[model samples]
Target: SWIYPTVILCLFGFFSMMRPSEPFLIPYLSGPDKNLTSAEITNEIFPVWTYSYLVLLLPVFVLTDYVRYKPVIILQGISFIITWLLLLFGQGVKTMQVVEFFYGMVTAAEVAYYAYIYSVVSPEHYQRVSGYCRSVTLAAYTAGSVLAQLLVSLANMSYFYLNVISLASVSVAFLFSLFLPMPKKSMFFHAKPWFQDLKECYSSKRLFYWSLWWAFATAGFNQVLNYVQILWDYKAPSQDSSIYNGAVEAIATFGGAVAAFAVGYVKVNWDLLGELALVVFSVVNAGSLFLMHYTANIWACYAGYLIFKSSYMLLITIAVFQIAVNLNVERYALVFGINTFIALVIQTIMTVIVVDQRGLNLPVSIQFLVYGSYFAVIAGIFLMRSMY
Candidate 1:
């Protein structure tokens, strides 16, 4: 029973995440058939996802726990279908905007996968199952990119066909999730005044600083990933422009895993290294953004992204370790959830100032320049904090 439930969870995660069209989403949207202007794709279409996600994450998180995980996991599956369905059939910029909103809910609903697993699995088997589920999705994600690259470059599959494949995969995910054994209880249903615990969690400089980096770094990383494809598409034209979006995504995901794994085996004065580490990696992130921005060469942009994501993943792992070691396990999820929410808030602010039509509405190339400065600001803040 334990093994099968774990296996089911892993497969649900697998098919749901194995989205072959994801790596080349921008090219597909901005290509001739879609007719979405670059600005429309970036400014009008994508910002809604962040706004939807920011508003929905906390509510769905609480909703998932209260209702138990199965229903929410299923909700994610349906959201996935609705998202791709709109992408495949829906037209107009507003339709794609709605697609982004459904996609946002898909992501928001995913909190249930892990949340449900803990309730169903035997406690003795928790660690093993957790690793199994996490690694499965990682593999599935990388596989999706690799498959997309092969199909696009090797075969003549249209981007539309890739969504067909994605739609089918998510249907399979939903099917198996239906078969997943339901949990009898959930986390909050199983258990905060919130304030006392939150204050205690952030009471120390060590944790607070790590949380700050966690929030800002995530915001910065998400913004870059969300829009980097536009830069790639701009620097070199897509549709037989020797695009390596899939290749770079595959490389970045694997690199992130390796860098995160490194933290598990290393030792240091984590507290002392806190701000200095933030300062250094934040500089690396800034440098990477500048490299992507200034270089006209597409390959240079790829190289910069590889370093950018790997560095972000590496530093985030450090932050996770620091936070985990210091806190009670009970509060750990709360803080991480809170940190993620803050990251979304930070990203929303960036999207408003940097990407939204209601705001600056810079061109894609120029957006990276702004992002470079934003990370520089993060590094500057941390360095000054370190000095004090």
Candidate 2:
């Protein structure tokens, strides 16, 4: 009993802890290797390597079913060290892309970790603790990002220091992972031919719907993180707006952590509330963009961004967690694999659309339209709830 819950909490924290490193990498790359353009660095070079992830993710899902969780996560620890090495030693425009690619594949461990946790955590316990889990997870992520910045200041933007810190976190998590109690593997992952495997897993419509919600939220909220940095870079009065942007993210995570803990105690009724939450957050998030443009006051813009983002993060967890637990336990890996696939694909498409306009620095108006589309999708999801 303790085994399952403990592993669940740890896995949740594992990926959550990885959160800070995600956003900080762009800055790390752009700082000293100032030779490469963000476009050249990210799209042309990073995408070449990082997108190779699509090939590796499906395989990890299949392997985890046969291998115990201990080995897989321990490997994540090893990969964490390599990832740090890449960050610290990687150089040149081309080297940055290759390292980022390796980084993406190594971090794919999160998928395995999530599937493993979902297998053990009962639906009822999941419901009871879902918010608290997300809250802690979000708080950790926010804290990590802020800490990443502090580390940079302390080390004066040295990639070597960043890598060392990253290595330590994964190593600690890896040590904890070794103690993880194994759960029974579901038959779905053992199935042959990826298509047939997917067919077997989707027998649970509830799980499919839940993962779909992940698709929606990640596509939108992720876009906010990815593109908003571009917004800050262009619009901020100073070159140092990364700190301001990190603060907005911290506020959102802090709010999300608080809300996650608070939501479980009440009968928080989230079906309609979730829909409305997404819709409202969409409006505010999109609205905040225009607001930022007109209002030169940096703090106000940051605060507004915080309110919109915090609400979105809080509500998305409720929606995803509700659906995740309903799926067949055996299909855990497949479900999460599909869940991540949907998220990454949608995110990639949305990113290509908004982020491609590199030179214009792209106006927030484009973001507003893309954001509005996500709201419309959420509205559709709410209308179709009866069908579920």
Candidate 3:
């Protein structure tokens, strides 16, 4: 039973994530396939995705457990289809807004995909298979990006067909989800009250600091991912040659994986040294952002993203371990969901202020400028606190 579920879940995770069209989405949209203006895509369409996500997250997190895990995983698959379907066949800015909106659903429901494995497997099996689950996902993404790069550079595939491949990939993911074994219980609805778990987990002083970094840094990290490709477009505007978005993402993902794996081999008092790691790596992240925003060369921009993503992954693995190391199984689920919700909300606020037309609606350059200062602030605050 456990064997069937884990294998199915891993396959579900792969097809859902192996989106080759993803890295090239901005280019596809701006390159006349969707026929969207760069600034309009940045300002008009994308902000809706942020707001839509946290709003959808509020409901899905609460509901995912009640309906059990398989259904929600299936829901995510359904959402993924609508995302690329619109991008592939539909037109107009409104259609793209819906594109963002549906993808938002896919991401928000992502909590269920991760949470499902825990409910299906025993505690012992959980610790063992969790790595397999995540590694499959990481592998799928890396392979997807590599495939996208090879096809675009070597085969000269059109971006429209890139999305066509994406649609088919996710459709397979949707089909796979239907085969997942329905679980008997979940972390929340089938379990006891979670209010105390929320109270008890955050009550620890160490837990508080790490989660602060997780929220701030996770929000900060996503801000870059959403907007970075647009910045690449800005850097090399006259670009008529082969596209490298997939290649850059592939290298960055591989670097981040190695950085994460390397974390397990090192030994230290994470409680004592954790804040120090945050302080130094935040600087690295900030510096990378500054380099990306300041440089006009596309290669420099690509290098900056690699450094930034890998550094963030290195610290984030630390945060995930630190937070989970102490909490109970149920509490960890609640805590993880809450922490992510807080991150998305923080992200939403930033999107409103920096990118939405309702707010400052700064361009990609100015947005990165603010993001760099934001991480620098995190680094300095941790530095000051570590001294205290």
Candidate 4:
């Protein structure tokens, strides 16, 4: 019955992937035109974008539920268009600074797309819908990376060309989003006692724990990944580094797709294994980070990075699935927004401590070690809670 709206959102996810993948991060940092240092690009430029997300994410998160998800999705599409345009035509560090702010806006918009699906569909179909959407998104990322590699390696295309294509794709996604149906009434439109609704949500310990796990562990994983190109820069620097990076991302995205697909066949008693699952995956993620950080071999770096990326992707999918299944479909955006806001706060704090000018500004290896430890600490917290 809701198939049209569902397909529309899934199509949006597919086109969204047409935007070039993470390998493009390489060119953003070291491409011939910009040529910024690791510290400059990683520590300075990247953090600002993330911080912008941190600042705006909560507001947008709350705003989406209040105003309805369609408008937020529309804003997200427009933001992506602006982001790609800046990447293509914009110049200088200052231009990129502004680019990053829009990048944050784009990230905030994603929550709307994700939550919109739940609003249109019944909870019974949550798993299938989430799986379908996530599968296409991951697959699209892999395909985009492969195509980007082909263009950069074989056709000798410039990063600018990739952005041109990305801008066009987002424009289409924006147009399609306009056709998606909007909900008549938001949960917050009448301004019910949000404090009480929020309290009711918070009272569910299982949901809270999962949300915290999703928030903190994800923040750690994402923060490390944001600077992962530095690891590649050190271990596998090349004139064709974009191709190399794209290849790695393709492999990781493929791994993620496979993992997402596997979720359907997997079953567990969250009551018995939930905490243990959290501890085990967090540790595994931690170990992967350590391996990537400690090893000097290029192949080792590649393998380590792949495992780290794939594992996090799978873990996030699992987290979202678990969280979505646990909460009301109507409150999906609100609960997700709360957890994401919490994660962004953690990320901002970690960013300041690990990478900011006022902070330690440790070397990349040490920084990864800190990331590994962050997950370890998360695992410990959950472990202790389980004990209590």
Task: Indicate which candidate wins on TM-score.
Answer: 3
- Candidate rank order under lDDT: 3, 1, 4, 2
Residue 194 shift from truth in candidate 3, angstroms: 7.5
Q: Model 3, 87: alpha-carbon shift in Å?
A: 0.9
- Model with the higher lDDT, candidate 1 or 3: 3
Which ten contiguous residues of candidate 1 have the minimum total lDDT? Answer: 189-198
How does each model score on lDDT?
0.82, 0.59, 0.83, 0.75
Q: Using lDDT as the measure, which candidate wins?
A: 3
Each prediction's RMSD over C-alphas, in Å, is 2.2, 5.4, 1.9, 3.1
Writing each residue's lDDT as its tens digit, candidate 1 over 224-331 gives: 878888888888888657787888899889888888778768877757775577778778888988898889899999999999988888888777776788565447
- Residue 71 CA displacement from its true place in model 4, Å: 2.6
- Candidate 3 wrong stretches, greater than 4 Å: 191-198, 238-241, 269-272
For model 3, residues 1-388, the per-residue Cα lDDT tens digits are 4787788888887887899987888788778556677889889988888877888997887778888877787778778877777778877879888988887887788777777777888887987798899899999999999999999978898888898999999999889987877777667667644445346556677777778778988898887888888888888762465458898899999998999999867877657785577778878888999999888788999999999998988888878877787678777877778888889889988788778898786787889999999988888897898798
Output the lDDT of residue 296, model 1. 86
Ranked candidates (TM-score, high to low): 3, 1, 4, 2
Task: Identify the runs in model 4 with alpha carbons over 4 angstroms from their true place.
Answer: 121-127, 190-193, 204-207, 240-243, 268-279, 321-326, 381-388
lDDT of 2 by residue, 229-331 (tens): 5455445523465344455666666776666556546576656664455555555655665575556566766776666566665667566567655555654
TM-scores for every candidate against the unseen true structure: 0.94, 0.71, 0.95, 0.87
Cα deviation at 253, candidate 3, in Å, is 0.9
lDDT of 4 by residue, 331-361 (tens): 7766767777888888888889888767787
